[PDB]
């Protein structure tokens, strides 16, 4: 009855995030390691199940410990029921769930059965139900000596494999319900990449502080599973440009353009979006290339434009945008207009690579209020964690623009992202850079649900690496989980 | 004739304080662990008993002495007799009761039986009737015979369980006036909590020495059990001002107050307080605002004042204080006045930042008769430990006084434990500082009894602490519990 | 397989939440008395469910009235199955559920089984998933006005024992983040709390009439939830505290302050709070001392102040705000300053008692904008009863200001409801003041879910209550319940 | 544990949506039939529930295909697990579901079992669990094989009977907000049924093509479940009326009208409505009476007007229209006017009958924005299928207007629905209109859920109806079925 291959029951495999480290650093009362049980365990059940419909029935976890004869502490390990907060519990309160206690100077693995508890026959797939945890906590702390400057850390591996009474219920075809579809980053390399925040190929890697200024991106803002965040689309070509209708004003060189759609529609100022998309999200000064398709006479138009973000008639919310052009009237209402952006250009009077602040969201209302409906934040919260920046050098028409542009996710990732719209079966993704040159790994990265990356370095430093080199996606995990320096 | 949980009756749960410590510092002889029989050796029992309102049957603990290969020592457990004091037991007396003496190096846990001895049917839980108790003592000091510059400080686990005649007699309701409400510390963070000893909100925590001066402030001193002592009370508005009657003394600007109750009424001398509540317990000139209202037309009326705490006439307890003030008039000594405090100032001729004396008590009583019923003095009874101080920083009006303030306690913590009124079933209580975003522990602090908080640390240090850090109760050990250094 | 105390399963006890009355103004068809099945509803069982993660039977539900022999009508109690609307169901359709009537007259306890339907093997405590519910509902008209006067008030009072084959499944530690934590409220007694909306003591309770202006304050909000609305702090030391730079203004005696933040920090205009953290909440003249700190020789000179909010130059939400101060030029631009409150004075040149109007809420952004994101109106409902007000009163310097204050929580209250977090039951819980010394209930009053009490009272009226009297939580009941008269 | 009668567990019965058709004119791989499991499927069972609360248990299904014998074809039957979505499925992953292909030529009735697929005891009546669904599709396109011009659509029957296993839970009382109240038609005629649009009775039925205009009315939209779009309003006379404040504009005619509420309050621009309720959705001038009560003296004035639905002007959304007169007094400003449609008028200059423009949509907000809110555009979906309009004939008073009408559904059938808020089981309701007198059928016409009647005929062609007949409802077909030509 939907039986499966008898190795997979006759033996162990490792679990996706199943390994851990203990450092005399730890304290008691730390959540060392935590995993909901489930098929995802094993990655072999992970992808059969893709096929089946329901699945009951516990498991058995081997737990591998390195440690030897010269070391003390304990830990322990504990299956915490379906609904019950695991945040906050005391050291001493663990125990009192059914716990088992492994010393640090074990050799033989410890096995432990984890049964499934339920309320119902079996469990769906698409239904995501609550599933009994595993917690592994430190109980008694870590004494032993340290060989040099190097501290004896010890590492537990975790490997699962399906109880007898694991069995799947109804078959059903493999790819027509991308619940259960796994998720996959794409593998293009670090310099075909194209950055999101403006049409501009990606040029390096940043890393460094970002405490003294609030990193609030409003493009490429998109979670794990496939959701849209404050302005940011698919389209690598609409990033920052505008169409609909332009007005000329008398007395001067400027114009009023009136937003339209990106398919030439009415715009609606009530939507929930902070601005139409494609609005850039920085302020400074951009030059652009203005382009009409006017009847009549004909329609060969384009002259050299220039639009502020920081302007006080900047109202992209409202529909209503400044540009300054070079010619006194040559344009008309009534025809629809594009403007293609070129680069960012700087004003006499200001300080040098002050203008373009990346940081600094402009007031897309205007005066009238405060903008509403922003992306999230994003700041790191672990010690040691910086964030990763796809950065890229911008040209400039006239002075000297602060050249440096970042992005915490390319238009690429995004798109993928919202291609394939794979559920995250954690709170962050195990993302490591590797060379397929020679096989090996430059360095580790988090990949957080909220749509940003973390590594563990301090100060500033330009990431070297091979042009070959790309991600690649190991295991969800849980935020307990630590990285090693880079 | 109750039933208990067939669960617990076979599984082993660690007791709330039931974790200790072995370490080099601790010289023979010293009672290291201490518990008296009863529903507090196992958190579900401590919590079942608060249903009933008897018990009687024995224990069985298992202790977990998991040490390190290198260390060498000797520990004794003893049951001692009901009726029979421990305040100066020796090892050798200890030897003469029942004894089962166990190394430090033992890996199997040390499995002890423990009968109730009783001359009744039961014991009453709302009583305090003495029982069998259990001592582990230190019999051999703890040497390490190991390479290298290391401390093997070993920490013992301690677990309990009920023997098959434990049972229950009468059922009660969990009222409030009972031996209930656990133990328990606010979850509020350093930022939001206020000063005792002065209305400024904290900023930071100190630690450093305290063998140079006398540690005994009157304001914000309570016990962990919900007693108040010296001048503490729970406003904290109320904390360093004064209401009552003026009187202008010819020829000068000063004038001579007589001070009110609490709310209206008149001071009594009699009472067995130092001071009326809320009188400030450092020596210095505070600076403050005079207000009257007359009730004649309404008219509110606030002038500038100035106290001088270190003068002869400031007595407090006579019921009598002196007020410095510019005006000398435009004041009816026939109307209630109230004096809300500003700031401290200091004479700029004397020393800089040394005439606020943080640490020196005024006394209340003037030249005649000398301070009566103080609050006990406050100092470290460890090698190594110091006091933790939540420093603020008042106010300054003129010069540069000495704006750096200490207090032990913060209001909010004095509040809530006069609110509620948790019995302490030890001396110290383990407080652990968290970073809820993170889950490590940042240091571990010991919460005396008598109101004061010790840490392990050598030399000044001001403590860097996360913005969302809290503190949280672990467990309750005795006074000889070593710390872990930060 | 579990075991409970024989006794619980052979005895009646009080449901914490089953106390309800019936008064001549409900109407057949109005619903009295709602309850889901749950171990809640059992004290003991209630306790022990905290012990527990899956409770797993039904239970015998009894009922007592106390009715005079006058008053007549019927009363019936009925089980709603796990998901069906209760919306509209009127009299004669409840009979068709498993019912009991009971006669108003009625000495002795009717008893109703409630056995439990589900189609899961047991039911979880931390979840929503639907239950049976007990109803209990009028079903003939009451006619009780031939006797005694005022309304005459019908009690009821509900038992429950759990069933023969109640269990539970799961044992866990009883956690403080359970989210099972019982409701309570601070035994502090009513003199040594502190008023929310200015660092002052409070002193009396007071009760009358709203209609003749808007109550809408924005200090001392708090719902009972433990979610800040409005403009609430924790801290009583910074209720109108204004921290921040300090510039002169040439040829007169006013400052221009701008606000940092109450950390010192860059202030955040971005924030959907109304006002910055701290401010006033009243149009008024407030008298205090601000003092300025120099860093490297602490001169620190404080200065006599006044802030005069409601007018065109207080716009604490844009981050200026106006100081009226005798030296106009005793002061370094280049040092952060602190306003310390001491109290309010009222114009001479204007009528006696009128410059502190408490209600009004000043013009936070001055002429630029109508505020927004204000906390929300309180109004009593019910007819019948009053708003109660924690009233107080400040000190005066000048002139002739009103004294009266009025806060609707004190700021203990705040912050025991915000460090809590207990869920909230219903959208009315049930407090009674009671006297320690001889354990007598003086009056009982509602504390509504939206952070405010209410006592059934008509006419202004003080208070006359003994120095030690705390209050204490019962239960939570709906908004049909009839409160007792109050009386003193 | 409730009994069914006998007679139900032994014979067959037709569900109510129970036959459908295959024709030439189907595609391979459409959904022919789609049904859930559950009392629906049987109509004693569909009554019985509605006393009940749950079930449990399977069914027995038969399918007649008597089909000629000169056609070929083949039918597939599959069963679709509960929580697996059927949204894209193609013939291939239907075949990898348990399957049975069959022809269309089939004599015998095919017998299929269904057995409930749950992971609960019971499901729940008032909640909408998914459950075991069948599904029946073209697998093989008919085609037919016989000499003569003719079209051999096949009729299929399905009947269904309860298994024995079948019970229910609870009882319930049969009250009005549940899964109650099949859904009905009135059995009221044509002819005093009442236009939506307009206050006109109607006097014919007309059928014709609708791809050279966009059809997208306002007025009197009604889903098939009891919920109103855009503008539609239950009173027949506040169709078209204005209510709300007059202003005379200095120099000319026109007057300025504020639009108050439905009855006196004062209109909200913030509502999700397109235009206050009662407001024409057809660009002409509308000629009626201003009506003025003065409470002066209690005098009615009543004044010829006409409005100008396409003005710039006309901007009901805003609150604010203008009305065109002959006098430009006698009307005060500060009292309640109500304005009451008597006709439609048209410049005769302009083109004939070619003014109304029944089928355009004038601009609820003027120049400025466009139209927001609209009920969604109403086509066509299967070949050969045109829309049914009820034609009425509004008067005229000027010049040769374009009196021809069409509207929807009658303001007693929108009336019903929102009445009634009968469930819809299925998205097209059959419809056959049938004489009483002589029980033969004229037509049969689907009635889409989204409000509106579809009928298979080909180009322009007045319905003719005997003055008895009336609409009566059969079963629930899907979007594929296909109509006997009339």
Not at 166 to 177: C, K, Q, R, S, Y
Request: aromatic share 10%; charged share 15%; glycine share 8%.
């Amino acid at each position: 009855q939907n039986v499966i291959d008898p190795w997979i029951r006759n033996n162990f495999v490792q679990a996706p995030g199943g390994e851990f480290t203990v450092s005399p650093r730890n304290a008691p009362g730390e959540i060392l390691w935590s995993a909901p049980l489930g098929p995802d365990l094993n990655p072999y059940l992970s992808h059969l199940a893709r096929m089946y419909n329901g699945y009951a029935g516990g498991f058995e976890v081997q737990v591998i410990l390195a440690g030897n004869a010269f070391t003390a502490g304990k830990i322990i390990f504990a299956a915490v029921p379906p609904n019950f907060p695991t945040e906050g519990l005391s050291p001493s309160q663990v125990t009192m769930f059914p716990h088992i206690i492994v010393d640090v100077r074990q050799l033989e693995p410890v096995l432990i059965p984890l049964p499934d508890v339920r309320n119902n026959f079996y469990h769906y797939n698409q239904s995501n139900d609550p599933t009994i945890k595993l917690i592994a906590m430190l109980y008694t702390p870590l004494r032993a000596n340290n060989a040099g400057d190097d501290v004896f850390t010890v590492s537990c591996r975790v490997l699962t494999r399906p109880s007898p009474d694991f069995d799947f219920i109804f078959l059903v075809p493999p790819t027509v319900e991308s619940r259960t579809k796994p998720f996959t980053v794409p593998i293009l390399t670090v310099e075909e990449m194209t950055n999101s925040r403006f049409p501009i190929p990606l040029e390096k890697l940043f890393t460094g502080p970002s405490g003294a200024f609030v990193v609030q991106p409003q493009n490429g803002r998109c979670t794990t599973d496939g959701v849209l965040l404050g302005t940011t689309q698919l389209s690598p070509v609409n990033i920052c440009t505008f169409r609909g209708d332009v007005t000329h004003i008398a007395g001067t060189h400027d114009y009023t353009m009136n937003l339209a759609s990106q398919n030439w529609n009415n715009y609606d100022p009530t939507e929930e979006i902070p601005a139409p998309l494609g609005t850039p999200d920085f302020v400074g000064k951009i030059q652009g290339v203005l382009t009409q398709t006017t009847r009549g006479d004909g329609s060969t138009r384009g002259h050299k434009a220039t639009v502020s973000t920081g302007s006080v008639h900047f109202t992209p919310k409202l529909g209503s945008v400044q540009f300054t052009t070079d010619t006194n009237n040559d344009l008309e209402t009534g025809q629809n207009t594009k403007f293609t952006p070129v680069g960012v250009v700087q004003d006499g009077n200001s300080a040098h690579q002050n203008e373009p602040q990346q940081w600094v969201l402009p007031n897309y209302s205007g005066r009238t209020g405060h903008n509403v409906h922003l992306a999230p934040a994003v700041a790191p919260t672990f010690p040691g964690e910086q964030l990763l920046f796809f950065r890229s050098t911008m040209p400039g028409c006239s002075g000297y623009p602060n050249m440096n542009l970042d992005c915490l996710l390319p238009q690429e990732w995004v798109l993928h992202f919202y291609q394939e719209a794979a559920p995250a079966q954690s709170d962050v993704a195990l993302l490591r850079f590797v060379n397929p040159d020679t096989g090996r790994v430059l360095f580790e990265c988090k990949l957080h649900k909220s749509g940003y990356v973390t590594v563990a370095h301090t100060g500033p430093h330009d990431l070297v690496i091979p042009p070959n080199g790309y991600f690649r996606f190991d295991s969800w995990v849980n935020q307990f989980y630590t990285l090693a320096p880079m």
